[PDB]
Amino acid sequence: SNATLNQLPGRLGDPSMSLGTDPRTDPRLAAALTQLGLADQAAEPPVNANSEVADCIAYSTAAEQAWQTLGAMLGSQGEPSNPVDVREETIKGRGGNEIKLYIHSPTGHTSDSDPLPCVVHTHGGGMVILTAADANYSRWRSELAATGLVVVGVEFRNAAGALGNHPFPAGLHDCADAAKWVASNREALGISTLIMSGESGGGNLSLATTMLAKKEGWLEEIAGVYAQCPYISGLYASKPEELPSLLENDAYFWDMKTMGAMVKPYDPTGENASNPLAWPYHASLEDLAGLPPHVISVNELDPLRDEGLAHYRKLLKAGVSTVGRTVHGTCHAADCSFVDVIPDVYFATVRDISAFAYSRA
Template sequence: MVLKTDPRTDPRLAAALAAFDMDVAPPPPPVGPDSPLQDRLDFLAEVEMALDGFHDAIFSDLPPVENVERSTHTIKGVDGNDVHLYIHQPKQATGLLPCVYHIHGGGMVVLEATGSNCERWRNELAALGLVVIGVEFRNGAGKLGNHPFPSGLHDCQSGLEWTFQNKAELGISKIIVHGESGGANLGLALSLKSKQEGKLEQIDGVYAMCPYVSGAYKNRNPSLTSLFENEEYFFSTSMLAILASVYDPEGSNQDNPFCWPLKAELETLQGLPPHVVSVNELDPLRDEGMEYYRKLLSAGVSAYSRMVMGTCHCADQDFRKAMPEVFAATIRDIQGFAYSL
C-alpha cells in the first residue's frame, strides 16, 4: 500500500503529492544510521536542499498575508551563540495578545525558520490575532549544523526566556510553545526542561503537531503500530532513523526525555501546563504522539488531542493550496487554544 492507493488518503492530498512523485514509496536512502557520520551529514544536506525546493514550490503563488508586521531580533544564547528570533505581529493591535512561540520541524537536524513554509505559518497565525515568534536554532546537520543535542534545545530555551522577559514590551499576555515534527520534540522537551529548572511560569501551554518523540526508528517499537502501518508514507522509518542518529550521534541519550520526550516518566510530566497533541492519520509518527498524549492524561495534565484525517505527516501545515480548509482548521485550533488559556 502507498499513499495514492490507500483509501484513507484525502484525494486532494494525493493529487498534490503526485505532482512531486511523493504519492508512492520514497527511494531507499543511500546511507543508514550506522554509516560514517560524514556520509550521513552529506546526505542530509542534500535532503535539506530538496525539502527547501519542495516547500518553495507548494507555497508559491499564494496571496500575501495582509496586516502583519514583521521584525527580527538577535540575542545571545546560553552557549554564547547568536539566536535569531522572527517576530510577526498583527498591525494596529490593541491590548495584550497571546504569543505562539514557534519551533520549526526538520527532525531537529535540518530546515530553517526562514523557510517559505515557516514564514507562511507565522504570518497566517499572526493574522488571527496572535504574536508569533519563530526561533532559529542550531541543527544537527544542514546549513545550520552540525550541532547535535542539546544545542538546538539550548537555543529554544534562550529564545523562550527572552520572550518571557519582554512580554510587556511585545504586548504578550501568555506564551504557547508550539512546534511540528522535530519542533514538537523540542517544544515538549522545553516544557520538561523548564519544569526541572523551576521555570514553568514561562510556558502557559504547549501545542505539539505530529511529534517526533520516541527515538524508536532503527529498532521499531511494535506497540507503535503506525511505524509499520504507515511506513514509507511521505518518508520512511529509515529516514527517521538517520535523523535520530545525527541528532544524538553517540546514542548516549536514548533514554533521556529531553532528547526523546516519550521516555519521560509520569512523575516528570506531572504539573506541566495544558497541552494539545495533534496527529496525522497517515503519519508513521501518529501513534507516538497519541502515546505521549495518553501519558499526559495519566500524569494529570490538562490535555486534548486531535487527529487530522486522510493526511500524511504535517500535511495540514504544508498543503495550504491543496487543502485550505484543513490548513485553516489547524491554525484556528491553535488560535482557540491560545485564547482559551
C-alpha cells in the first residue's frame, strides 16, 4: 500500500530508510522530527530482549524522563478552543490501592446538564512508563472533552518508572476498576455511555480491560472501544514473518530492541507471553466473541501497524463490529501528540473518537 512495484516499502526495500527519507512521511512531520533529531533511525538502545529484567526496569525508569519531556514539548504549547474543567478524584482499586482519576469536562457541565458521552482514557507508554499527568495526555483528554465529552484519565500503576514497579496485571486491574467506578457513577458524572480509548500500551490496556470485563461479567458497562496504534503482540524480539511492519518501520521513532526490553518489566517471568489479557494479539476467537463495537486506528509508518491490523481482522472473524483505519503519513502515535505540526491529522482523530463515542450513546 502506498508503494511501487519496483520497491517494497520502507526498510523492506531500502534498509537505510528512515522517517526523514521515507517518501510516505507527512513532510510537516518529517520536518518537525528532523528539527528534533528524531527523523533518522532511532539510536541503538543499551538494553534489549536479552537484557536482565532489572536492567530493563532501570533503563525504562531513565527513559521515562526523555519521553515525558518530548510529550511536554509537543502538548503544553496550547489549550483547547473550547473551555474545559479538570478535577481530580481518587478511588479504591480491588486490592486496596488508591487510583487517581483526572476528569475533564466542558466548563459548566454538571450532573444536572444533559448527559455527555464518556471516554475512559488509558494512556500509552508500553504499560511500563509515562503518566496521565503528562502534558500530552492531559492535552489529549482536554481536547476530547472540548468536543462535548467527559474524559476520565486513569492514573494506573506502571511496571517501571515513577509509578512502578507493578507487573501485569496491576495496571489492567486499575483500568478495569476505574471503568467500573465510572459505570457506577453515570449520574454523578453526567454521562450517557462509556467507551474505552487509548494508544499503544494504552490501546493494549483499553482492549484488555474490555476483554476482562467480559470475563468478569460486567461487559454491558462498556459500549465501545477505540484502540489507537495498539501495542499488543509482545513479539518485538523475534520479528515474526506475519508482522512485516516490525521490519519495515523498525527504528522509525522506536527501535524494536527497545520494545523487546520493555516487554520484560511488564511480565518479568515471561509466563504471560501468550496471555490475551497481557498481549491481546494472542486472543482466540472465543476471547473476542461478543465484545462491543471496536475501532482500530493504526499509523502507517509504525512498526506496530501490522499487529493492530491483524487484531482488527481477528475481531471481525469473532463477530465483533469493527472499523479499521490507517492514519497515513504518521509515525507511531503521531496523531496523539504532534498538535502543532499536523493539527489537521491530530484533530481528525480527536473528532473521530468523539463522534464514535456519541454514536454509542
